[PDB]
Scaffold this motif. Structure first.
Motif, PDB file in Angstrom:
ATOM      1  N   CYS B  20      93.092  29.368   7.236  1.00  0.00           N
ATOM      2  CA  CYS B  20      92.468  29.782   8.483  1.00  0.00           C
ATOM      3  C   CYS B  20      93.242  29.238   9.679  1.00  0.00           C
ATOM      4  O   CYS B  20      93.498  28.029   9.746  1.00  0.00           O
ATOM      5  CB  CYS B  20      91.022  29.307   8.547  1.00  0.00           C
ATOM      6  SG  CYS B  20      90.088  30.000   9.927  1.00  0.00           S
ATOM      7  N   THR B  22      92.153  29.216  12.828  1.00  0.00           N
ATOM      8  CA  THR B  22      91.254  28.765  13.880  1.00  0.00           C
ATOM      9  C   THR B  22      90.231  27.748  13.390  1.00  0.00           C
ATOM     10  O   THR B  22      89.338  27.379  14.157  1.00  0.00           O
ATOM     11  CB  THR B  22      90.532  29.954  14.523  1.00  0.00           C
ATOM     12  OG1 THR B  22      89.849  30.713  13.520  1.00  0.00           O
ATOM     13  CG2 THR B  22      91.521  30.852  15.237  1.00  0.00           C
ATOM     14  N   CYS B  47      86.280  32.958  15.034  1.00  0.00           N
ATOM     15  CA  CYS B  47      87.045  33.707  14.043  1.00  0.00           C
ATOM     16  C   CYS B  47      87.751  34.878  14.708  1.00  0.00           C
ATOM     17  O   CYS B  47      87.105  35.722  15.334  1.00  0.00           O
ATOM     18  CB  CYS B  47      86.127  34.198  12.929  1.00  0.00           C
ATOM     19  SG  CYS B  47      86.926  35.218  11.680  1.00  0.00           S
ATOM     20  N   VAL B  48      89.079  34.940  14.571  1.00  0.00           N
ATOM     21  CA  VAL B  48      89.815  36.071  15.134  1.00  0.00           C
ATOM     22  C   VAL B  48      89.846  37.272  14.207  1.00  0.00           C
ATOM     23  O   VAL B  48      90.213  38.363  14.648  1.00  0.00           O
ATOM     24  CB  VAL B  48      91.261  35.701  15.513  1.00  0.00           C
ATOM     25  CG1 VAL B  48      91.268  34.838  16.753  1.00  0.00           C
ATOM     26  CG2 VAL B  48      91.969  35.005  14.371  1.00  0.00           C
ATOM     27  N   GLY B  49      89.461  37.114  12.945  1.00  0.00           N
ATOM     28  CA  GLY B  49      89.367  38.248  12.047  1.00  0.00           C
ATOM     29  C   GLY B  49      90.662  38.668  11.395  1.00  0.00           C
ATOM     30  O   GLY B  49      90.841  39.851  11.105  1.00  0.00           O
ATOM     31  N   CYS B  50      91.566  37.729  11.144  1.00  0.00           N
ATOM     32  CA  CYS B  50      92.885  38.037  10.610  1.00  0.00           C
ATOM     33  C   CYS B  50      92.889  38.298   9.115  1.00  0.00           C
ATOM     34  O   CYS B  50      93.893  38.796   8.597  1.00  0.00           O
ATOM     35  CB  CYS B  50      93.845  36.886  10.912  1.00  0.00           C
ATOM     36  SG  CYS B  50      93.312  35.274  10.293  1.00  0.00           S
ATOM     37  N   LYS B  51      91.808  37.966   8.413  1.00  0.00           N
ATOM     38  CA  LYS B  51      91.706  38.077   6.961  1.00  0.00           C
ATOM     39  C   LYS B  51      92.800  37.307   6.237  1.00  0.00           C
ATOM     40  O   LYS B  51      93.107  37.608   5.085  1.00  0.00           O
ATOM     41  CB  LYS B  51      91.703  39.539   6.506  1.00  0.00           C
ATOM     42  CG  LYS B  51      90.739  40.411   7.258  1.00  0.00           C
ATOM     43  CD  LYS B  51      90.255  41.547   6.395  1.00  0.00           C
ATOM     44  CE  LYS B  51      88.810  41.877   6.683  1.00  0.00           C
ATOM     45  NZ  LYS B  51      88.458  43.226   6.194  1.00  0.00           N
ATOM     46  N   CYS B  53      92.380  34.497   5.130  1.00  0.00           N
ATOM     47  CA  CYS B  53      91.658  33.834   4.053  1.00  0.00           C
ATOM     48  C   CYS B  53      91.535  34.733   2.836  1.00  0.00           C
ATOM     49  O   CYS B  53      91.648  34.265   1.700  1.00  0.00           O
ATOM     50  CB  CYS B  53      90.278  33.421   4.544  1.00  0.00           C
ATOM     51  SG  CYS B  53      89.444  34.704   5.502  1.00  0.00           S
TER      52      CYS B  53
HETATM   53  S1  SF4 Z   1      89.610  36.065   9.048  1.00  0.00           S
HETATM   54 FE1  SF4 Z   1      89.435  34.214   7.709  1.00  0.00          FE
HETATM   55  S2  SF4 Z   1      91.401  33.089   8.033  1.00  0.00           S
HETATM   56 FE2  SF4 Z   1      91.223  34.596   9.749  1.00  0.00          FE
HETATM   57  S3  SF4 Z   1      90.219  33.418  11.439  1.00  0.00           S
HETATM   58 FE3  SF4 Z   1      88.539  34.462  10.286  1.00  0.00          FE
HETATM   59  S4  SF4 Z   1      87.860  32.910   8.747  1.00  0.00           S
HETATM   60 FE4  SF4 Z   1      89.896  32.212   9.521  1.00  0.00          FE
END
Ligand code: SF4
Ligand code: SF4
Ligand code: FES
Lengths: 66, 80, 143, 97
Positions: B20, B22, B47-51, B53
């Motif tokens: 992650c 962030t 959460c920026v939503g980059c996936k 993870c």
């Molecule tokens: S999508 Fe997953 S890795 Fe990306 S910022 Fe959100 S929780 Fe963190």
């Protein structure tokens, strides 16, 4: 008395969100300690989209084939 | 803020928390796996939503899931 | 239960020449972030916005505009160097907020004083169909 | 073929015999000397360990540094013991740094 299928058996997958669903794999270890919800470890012949070849499963998602 | 959910198929490998960018995720104690570990997502307002993870999780199917939701300043990654 | 450190201003900053990547109006009216670390000696490092800076021997205090900037800088500082860092969020009110690491330990190591947020006790294949949640504002993964 | 394996461990150091076509982890699984694992798929650092002698086949190993396989660390669950080896267990964090 241990649990689950035998080690090195041939089992069929019933977890439909699985890549190997309705396919077959070979058991390699069945965690005997309860409190684990997915004890069976199954190794497969082909890799999935994440390039992985082994996964944990529950006891009822696995059906012994012959 | 996006949504992030952890499912009980998690094997507690920690690979998602390491990825992650962030610091959304965290490890917490558990009893349902050999690692006695489970992931949690306490800080989803960043959460920026980059996936990033999801690319890291090894279970089939995934044990961490990111559902994109309403957008904010932090979620869009705006420096102005 | 792990009192968090305080923000000590008058902490010096690295030796920078200035750049067009720093703070903007959002830091005036909405929020900005501040990272601090230790730096056993003076050394050069790549700014997460522009070119290179020199961190001073002793405490260091940088002001950035995003949490991701602070965390990328901290990851670089923690692995390539062996340095401990903390960062904070400052509002236009003059209010600080210790941000990371939250409970004193790094999140990739399990600490016994943490609760579970966003954990479903089932597999992902056992979510209801959307038809089960139609006209009521929940989502199938909400459960 | 089935070379003898040596694993230092907080429990001690024990040996078990096991063919070269196998992964170390299932072979320490056979005789019953417990080791720490999470993935069994070569995509984490719980089964990490380093070597005292010989060297272990790491062909089907991934998610590792372009060095972790040239300065000692090894994942026990995707590793073929080409020789009579002598290895470490519970070695994740001094690998995790
Ligand atoms: S999508 Fe997953 S890795 Fe990306 S910022 Fe959100 S929780 Fe963190
Ligand atoms: S990567 Fe998946 S299995 Fe590993 S800790 Fe994160 S959610 Fe759990
Ligand atoms: S379990 Fe993590 S590498 Fe084998």
């Amino acid at each position: 008395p241990p649990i689950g299928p035998k080690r090195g058996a041939k089992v069929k997958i019933l977890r439909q969100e699985s890549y190997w669903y309705k396919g077959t794999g070979s058991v390699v270890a069945v965690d005997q300690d309860p409190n684990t919800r997915y004890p069976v470890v199954v190794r497969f012949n082909k890799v999935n989209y994440a390039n992985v070849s082994t996964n944990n499963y529950a006891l009822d998602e696995v059906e012994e084939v012959k | 803020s996006h949504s992030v959910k952890i499912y009980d198929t998690c094997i507690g490998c920690t690979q998602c928390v390491r990825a992650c960018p962030t610091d959304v995720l965290e490890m917490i104690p558990w009893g349902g796996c050999k690692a006695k570990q489970i992931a949690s997502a306490p800080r989803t307002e960043d959460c920026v939503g980059c996936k990033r993870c999801e690319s890291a999780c090894p279970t089939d199917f995934l044990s961490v899931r990111v559902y994109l939701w309403h957008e904010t300043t932090r979620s869009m990654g705006l420096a102005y | 239960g792990f009192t968090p450190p305080e923000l000590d201003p008058n902490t010096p900053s690295p030796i920078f020449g200035g750049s067009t990547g720093g703070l903007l109006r959002k830091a005036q009216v909405e929020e900005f972030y501040v990272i601090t670390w230790e730096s056993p000696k003076e050394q050069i490092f790549e700014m997460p916005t522009g070119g290179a800076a020199i961190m001073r021997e002793g405490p260091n205090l940088l002001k950035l505009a995003r949490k991701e900037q602070c965390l990328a800088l901290g990851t670089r500082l923690r692995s390539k160097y062996k340095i401990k860092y903390q960062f904070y969020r400052v509002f236009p009110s003059g209010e600080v907020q210790y941000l990371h690491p939250k409970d004193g330990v790094y999140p990739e190591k399990v600490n016994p004083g943490r609760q579970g947020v966003g954990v479903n006790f089932r597999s992902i294949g056992k979510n209801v169909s959307p038809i089960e949640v139609k006209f009521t504002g929940k989502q199938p993964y909400d459960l | 073929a089935s070379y003898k394996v040596k694993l230092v461990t907080p429990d001690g150091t024990q040996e078990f015999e096991c063919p070269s076509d196998v992964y170390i982890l299932d072979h320490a699984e056979e005789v019953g000397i417990d080791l720490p694992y999470s993935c069994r798929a070569g995509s984490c650092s719980s089964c990490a360990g380093k070597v005292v002698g010989g060297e272990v086949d790491q062909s089907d190993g991934s998610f590792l540094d372009d060095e972790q396989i040239e300065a000692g660390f090894v994942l026990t669950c995707v590793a073929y013991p080409t020789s009579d080896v002598v290895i470490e267990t519970h070695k994740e964090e001094d690998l995790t740094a």
